[PDB]
Paper text:
Here, sequences at the N and C termini of the HD-domain stabilise inter-monomer protein–protein interactions and incorporate four pairs of allosteric nucleotide-binding sites, AL1 and AL2, which regulate the enzyme through combined binding of G-based (AL1) and 2′-deoxynucleoside (AL2) triphosphates. Using combined biophysical and X-ray structural studies incorporating nucleotide analogues along with mutagenesis experiments we have now discovered that SAMHD1 uses a bi-metallic Fe–Mg centre to catalyse dNTP hydrolysis in a reaction similar to those catalysed by HD domains in both human and bacterial phosphodiesterase PDE enzymes.
However, no measurable triphosphohydrolase activity could be detected for the H215A mutant, even when elevated levels (10 µM) of H215A–SAMHD1 were employed in the assay, confirming its critical function in catalysis. In the structure, the bound active site dAMPNPP nucleotide adopts the same configuration as that observed in the wt and D137N structures. A 3D structural superimposition of the H215A and wt structures based on alignment of all SAMHD1 atoms reveals an overall rmsd of only 0.531 Å. In addition, we solved a further structure of the catalytically inactive mutant H215A, which does not disrupt metal ion binding, with dAMPNPP bound in the active site. In all our structures the active site side chain configurations, nucleotide conformation and metal ion–water network are all conserved, including in the H215A structure.
Numbering used by the authors:
A (entry chain A): 113 to 276, 284 to 599
B (entry chain D): 114 to 276, 284 to 598
C (entry chain B): 113 to 276, 284 to 598
D (entry chain C): 113 to 275, 284 to 598
Write the structure that this text describes.
Amino acid sequence: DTMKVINDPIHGHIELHPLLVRIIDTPQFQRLRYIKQLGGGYYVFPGASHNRFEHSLGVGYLAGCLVHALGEKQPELQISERDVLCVQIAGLCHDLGHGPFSAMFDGRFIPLARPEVKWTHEQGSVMMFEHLINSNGIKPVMEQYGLIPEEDICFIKEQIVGPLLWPYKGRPENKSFLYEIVSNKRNGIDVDKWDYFARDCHHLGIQNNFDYKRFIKFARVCEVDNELRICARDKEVGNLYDMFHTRNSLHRRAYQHKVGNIIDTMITDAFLKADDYIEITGAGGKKYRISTAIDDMEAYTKLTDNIFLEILYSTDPKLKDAREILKQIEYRNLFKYVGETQPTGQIKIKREDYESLPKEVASAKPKVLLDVKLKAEDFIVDVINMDYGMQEKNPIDHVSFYCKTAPNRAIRITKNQVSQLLPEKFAEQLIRVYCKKVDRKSLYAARQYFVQWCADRNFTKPQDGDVIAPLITPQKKEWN
Amino acid sequence: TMKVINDPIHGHIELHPLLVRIIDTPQFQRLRYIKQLGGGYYVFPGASHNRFEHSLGVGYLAGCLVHALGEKQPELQISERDVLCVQIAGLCHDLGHGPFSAMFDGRFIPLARPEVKWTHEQGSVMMFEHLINSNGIKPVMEQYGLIPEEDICFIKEQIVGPLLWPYKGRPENKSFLYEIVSNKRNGIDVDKWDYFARDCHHLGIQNNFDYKRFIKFARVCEVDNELRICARDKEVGNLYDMFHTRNSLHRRAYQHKVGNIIDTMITDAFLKADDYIEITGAGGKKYRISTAIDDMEAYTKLTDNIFLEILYSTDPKLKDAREILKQIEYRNLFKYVGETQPTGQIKIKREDYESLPKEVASAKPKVLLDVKLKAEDFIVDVINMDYGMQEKNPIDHVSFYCKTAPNRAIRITKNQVSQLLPEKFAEQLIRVYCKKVDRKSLYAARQYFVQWCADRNFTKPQDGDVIAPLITPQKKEW
Amino acid sequence: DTMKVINDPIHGHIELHPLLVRIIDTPQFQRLRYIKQLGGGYYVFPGASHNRFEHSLGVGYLAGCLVHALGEKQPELQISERDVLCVQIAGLCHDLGHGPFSAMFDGRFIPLARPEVKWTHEQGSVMMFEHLINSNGIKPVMEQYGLIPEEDICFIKEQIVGPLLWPYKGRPENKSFLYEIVSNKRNGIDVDKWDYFARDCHHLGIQNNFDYKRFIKFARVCEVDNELRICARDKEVGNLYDMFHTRNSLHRRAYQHKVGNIIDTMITDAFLKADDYIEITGAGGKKYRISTAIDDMEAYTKLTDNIFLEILYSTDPKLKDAREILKQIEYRNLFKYVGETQPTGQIKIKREDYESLPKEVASAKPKVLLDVKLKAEDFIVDVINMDYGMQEKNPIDHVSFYCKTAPNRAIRITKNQVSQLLPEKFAEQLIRVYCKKVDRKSLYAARQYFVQWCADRNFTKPQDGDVIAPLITPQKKEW
Amino acid sequence: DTMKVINDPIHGHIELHPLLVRIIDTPQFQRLRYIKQLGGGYYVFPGASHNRFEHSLGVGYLAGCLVHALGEKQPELQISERDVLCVQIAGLCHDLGHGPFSAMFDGRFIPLARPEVKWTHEQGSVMMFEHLINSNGIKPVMEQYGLIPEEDICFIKEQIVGPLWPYKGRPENKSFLYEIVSNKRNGIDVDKWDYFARDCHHLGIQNNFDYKRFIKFARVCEVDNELRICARDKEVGNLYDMFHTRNSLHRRAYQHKVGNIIDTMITDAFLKADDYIEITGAGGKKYRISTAIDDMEAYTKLTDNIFLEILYSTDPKLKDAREILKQIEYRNLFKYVGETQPTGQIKIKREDYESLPKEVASAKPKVLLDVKLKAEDFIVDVINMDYGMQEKNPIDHVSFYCKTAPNRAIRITKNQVSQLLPEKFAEQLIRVYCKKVDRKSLYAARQYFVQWCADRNFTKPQDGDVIAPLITPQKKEW
Ligand SMILES: Nc1ncnc2c1ncn2[C@H]1C[C@H](O)[C@@H](COP(=O)(O)NP(=O)(O)OP(=O)(O)O)O1
Ligand SMILES: Nc1ncnc2c1ncn2[C@H]1C[C@H](O)[C@@H](COP(=O)(O)NP(=O)(O)OP(=O)(O)O)O1
Ligand SMILES: Nc1ncnc2c1ncn2[C@H]1C[C@H](O)[C@@H](COP(=O)(O)NP(=O)(O)OP(=O)(O)O)O1
Ligand SMILES: Nc1ncnc2c1ncn2[C@H]1C[C@H](O)[C@@H](COP(=O)(O)NP(=O)(O)OP(=O)(O)O)O1
Ligand SMILES: [Fe+3]
Ligand SMILES: [Fe+3]
Ligand SMILES: [Fe+3]
Ligand SMILES: [Fe+3]
Ligand SMILES: [Mg+2]
Ligand SMILES: [Mg+2]
Ligand SMILES: [Mg+2]
Ligand SMILES: [Mg+2]
Ligand SMILES: [Mg+2]
Ligand SMILES: [Mg+2]
Ligand SMILES: [Mg+2]
Ligand SMILES: [Mg+2]
Ligand SMILES: [Mg+2]
């Protein structure tokens, strides 16, 4: 059991302490090799073959860089070797709970398959971590390196998911800044983002403009309303606004690419159709479904992107409907993108209303004669909440800064102290509509229903509206 | 025959022999001795690159864009002659830059000769004329199918704009050709694409705009009776990002507060040297640094080397200028005091710039001060940051097409894209510096500065509470 | 109907003609999304997650760049749009025959599982291409775009695998240069190498020093012994030696990494143990095994890296032995590397002798006290043939060059006309030894047998010889 | 008084201790901003605008990374903060002695201008460092941060230029510290790692050596009673590749035939200017270009600027020098005729270089020729290509360790690595050029050249059968 060096193309040669190597070399960690980081995005950006495994190594590594850098510059914080290891382990294990195709599984499939549960991959990560530890004899290995499992397991879990006065048990207040490394609940400025920006960009073929290494150099811990927090140099404020701008830009260009999303939707659909028939063996030989494997970590261990191919290659007549959806993916007979719009004014589309939207689009009465009627079943309506990670809030209002002439003194910097060219709002909704019927006449009709629906709901005019529905767009006074 | 040249940004590029003849002149080779980012090199040490290599890059990209349009749309009748003219314009577009590039036309000439309205682009047109005439290039143009009466004019118009349909070099059915090198309608041009990529490579800041993607999706469509370059509808987000990147490169690098003060110091040294340096132009006439812009033979010999000519001089008359450049090398720079912006609808007008150091020195901070500072001790640098068209959204001046009707041009408004985009497209930054560098002068300069910000109802400096703790409580709006 | 653009991180935005899009959007092509380019190398270099799919797009694209560039510079060659499409399709389809974990499948598994057949992934690519065309109605689509399927399918196949006097039917000798793009049988200078150099490096985190774009700019077709062939500028000769040096260096640093190879070996072992029990359905419902799916393209279509996980997640008691080997991979209880050596002198280890080598290692008699005796079954001996792509030959002796003052005149350039610092030989063998028993005492013993065996065979001294076997290495004066 | 961070595109954000900042902010250091790293190479590779200044920052930084990494992994070595600063200073100052156009100045000009002296830029760096320290009051600043100037100045100089135990600055138990900046035992030093990475970034050729990996695997072990830097055994292949890369960068870039002829032309102009240019040194004494190396105050003012000072001069005495530089700017370069190498055991010695143009002109090609050419018309450039230690394999002078005994040093021979490695480690290339550029002179120059190769039993030029079809059949060995 000695330290390993591993060559990562994003971070270079990184060092893994032998405790981390023991954690990595388990079935529960290695599972992340079989889950694509960007899910259906690989079917649009062919360089995006990367898996959660390598992202997880990167987050472990960066978490270690940030806590080491803080410890070197500020010995008064009393960051111990034990703290450093716990922060690295949390970085390493933070995404253990992702399911097949990553964001698809907790963003689309589980909410549709099991609308009663409130589940996130982060909860999965905590449960999977527990199962990793318990089934591989890791507690004695922790003790061998000076960790205290009652306290430190709890600390690690709290870093990943948040709390399970001062709500944490794993560390006291004098170590609060340690909870801001892996997953920053105050403002989202965390090393998870820095790894995925750099790694996704390298694979996508879109270039990263955020400099995380610069941020680490300028980061300090300062007292802010009587808690010790990570603060940035004042002159980095512009770079932080740019960080969130980059995040939003990566969601627009890649993560919410309209076809990447429809592939995720189709896979979700196939999983919903397969769910009654696929059996996954968990603890004590009990049988779980795709939707219930989240309840038993032994089952969930075996639930990866492989399930796609298990369905695609099946012959069972019961899986026929699921299998045909995946066949449609491989022949590229995808549901067709019709367009994009947004609400106007103070209108917000609520999650309770999502299910009713296909019916609304099909009920629009385009004032043009139509040969084809389309039914609700024929439309998909995907509502995407785009923000700066804190709903309507400006995350930079929850960051603290310091100045070169008083480096222990935290200050606030407001938006108006930076620039007038920044966003005026921090949240918005995009609505994408697609049609399951792909023939030319159905598609012409779907465009008319769509643009009419936008007019009826007082949504923004689709960008191509005048071209795809020339007879509809003149009817709307606010569009001309 | 063609030459190949290896550029680190674009790879191996081909130069037509007419371009090679233009490059191999004193007028073009001059660009090897003018830093792209001027004083920026004194802050970002990778930014050693010169205007020469930027110019090759713009020539190359100009050629890629016009070739791509011609291949996709043969009905436009883009000729080999048109391609060469566009390449030449890209190659020669920055011939007019002076020592330290933006410093020379942005700071020095306006101060040295406030009566003239000069730009490097005007310089590029005059330098091009002088390059052609003094190196026998007109017959070589003819040899390759160009018509110099028409094409020289076309080339110049591409660089500087017009010298109803205001252009003589090409008719309306070729208006798109004027949108490649320097796009007067919206600023979306290959010059930006080269400098984004090249500056980033050298600065150590990463480029996020994909120019190659833009070229693939570009088409020419009819818009209000002219053939113009349009982009695919779905690229609109990427164009907003393009201008966001431009603004971000100005914030991080080009307007870095110390890069600018170095540019200011060099400008100061040039103003102090201007009466004493003689540069010989055409017919043996004698020019100064500030007048060499009137004669391209003189201007040919004015490059960044003038910095070292002053620094190494022994002439007592250049003592004052020389001492400023010595201060740069010891890093005894004028000191940054801080940054602020106007509030509300307030605009600082160019006529008022000269009065601002006096205003800062006239502030009466209610604080005990060892030193009184005079107007001459402050520099107040006002920077106009925008999306290239003052208050306007340049995306309102772009045309788009949709996949289902690719010959039909459309407009896309800001509200059709995103609510997270900027609400304004122009703003002003105000940096204040002090020429007196000792600890007590600097403490005082901070008090005058923050008090001035309070008095003018400008934004609170980011470090205001720390540098002037007794001043910032006075102002209710902070 | 129309062209698609696709964004690749290595080549940027590439354009795909609609005929290529029809070929790509088939089960037979999309299969390549589930086959890792570097196989077991992903278990060593975590950035090497890339699959054969994206490599195939890249080779298609570069094949098109090279043939377009030749056509633009030399209209007299009469390169047609039809030729361009055929070269693109060949580049796109060249690796359709790879199996699970790529080089593992044709380099290790098939040779062990079916030693009677002479099979390569390239043969697989030809058969898979035939099956792709026939089962997706591609022939009429080819006709729609000006291709002539009798001739052009044959041309495409020949570009991939070679011939199936002038031995080719798809194109004549005045177009011989077209066979030098995707897979160059004369000297190995082909666009396949250029894509994988660039793509592997980007993912591995090792940097590429070969500039393929420069090579394309300087490439011309010239007459050489009555065939039209691709020639390089004279002054590029250095860069071509560097190309093969880079290839060799990527094999040393990554592709033949000792642990990447042992993982490939372990997976192969698990597949051999699973082979009797896994059923893959092929044409007419017939059942194939892992080792026989190469005989039926409908079965082979469904044979990808997924088989690893099918074994790993199985519960069938019959798959227990295969499953346990894959569990050993996941816990990193790997067969242990003992060391590396090479033959000396004139000695060449022949393929017929590979199987006898573990027995030789176990028969060595190290004069050292050992608690554990090891048997032949405990050693793995992996022999790797490292060369410049043409066994003992210098591939640069099979390249033609031209000079700036006579660009249509082909010439030869010998090694002595370039540099005295170049390699003296172009082939060698590396011998890696591993031990299947992983405890510290077995490993100590394995090192003594290994170093003694090297001494006995007069192989090169292992680099760490003095440290791992201090009592053995003094016996050998020449060490 | 506080640390500075600087953004370099090769190494990222690097930290500079305030003592380093004081050294950098002097005229003697800042001088390096005006000397191109690759000299005339910029006139072939237009991305290669980089100067010695940024290379020097990089070497300072890497020197610091290597010594820090050794200290972190091996606390028993007792590397102090003082040792780290001294190694950084040496890295930073190691190239202070370069002259105009870098390798051109000490490789071509000084040897020709002053054949009696044995001068290297490294000697210059030591003298320039001494002058930097003494004229900027640096010794008290060193003391303020824990350095001992009697000892540490000596240590710093020994690291730059070299020397029982021959060093005075540090004892044997710290010998490894002398292997960071300039490694005299085998050449594996951080100077190479910076220039590989930085040159590649600017040239547009990609670097394949991973220096960071080497740093991770580097350890100090006892070797024949000295503590030395050793590499992991399995890195041996990577080290052979390192020297292969060095050779490959010399072939592609640094010894590019046209880059060298430009260096030669500039050298020629400097030789013609040398009697007439005056550079003021200490106490107002006057130096020449060739003598400015004797006085650091003069040498401080000798940079690439001298090129433009000559080009723009009007003095009649500089006419010949000026005309050569004009020929560079119009691209009327001496023409490359070809390349060959000696055969067998033959080595061309430096004493014989001057006689070679005469030999080429004395060859008697049995061919009808329009022009007879004289010795003065040919340039013969002889280049020594090696792995940095003449005929020796530098890997024979490296020590390694194994994972199972990391404190135990071992040797690894070439046969333990690969049969595909080089069989020799040194060779000579001979390039011939002609000063007469017309077609008939050039035809003749090719005939003399190929005949000369045949007469001396040199290798057949690669294009020999094409440029001299009547000459190459005479030689049986071809
Ligand atoms: N020459 C090279 N260049 C770059 N990366 C390389 C490399 N060789 C390997 N890597 C990558 C592969 C891995 O990501 C990492 C480590 O590979 P090893 O350093 O080969 N270490 P291992 O555990 O095999 O040997 P041991 O136990 O004897 O120390 O570097
Ligand atoms: N091996 C190499 N690899 C990469 N870039 C290179 C290179 N060699 C040169 N460059 C860069 C340097 C230049 O930017 C460009 C062209 O250099 P040449 O191809 O050397 N052309 P020249 O005009 O000397 O030879 P001729 O007239 O005989 O064809 O490539
Ligand atoms: N903003 C962006 N920047 C870079 N690459 C991008 C990108 N957006 C997509 N890609 C990549 C993803 C793909 O690899 C490629 C094409 O994506 P689309 O241009 O979005 N084309 P699609 O076929 O969806 O829309 P249509 O049929 O309406 O033209 O570019
Ligand atoms: N946003 C940015 N991104 C990347 N590099 C940047 C940068 N801004 C500056 N640089 C580069 C330029 C330099 O190479 C380096 C340091 O520039 P500053 O951090 O601005 N430091 P200074 O001394 O001006 O301010 P103070 O004294 O208040 O700390 O970073
Ligand atoms: Fe994550
Ligand atoms: Fe420009
Ligand atoms: Fe391939
Ligand atoms: Fe150096
Ligand atoms: Mg997560
Ligand atoms: Mg998060
Ligand atoms: Mg301009
Ligand atoms: Mg412009
Ligand atoms: Mg502006
Ligand atoms: Mg293949
Ligand atoms: Mg091959
Ligand atoms: Mg040196
Ligand atoms: Mg050296």
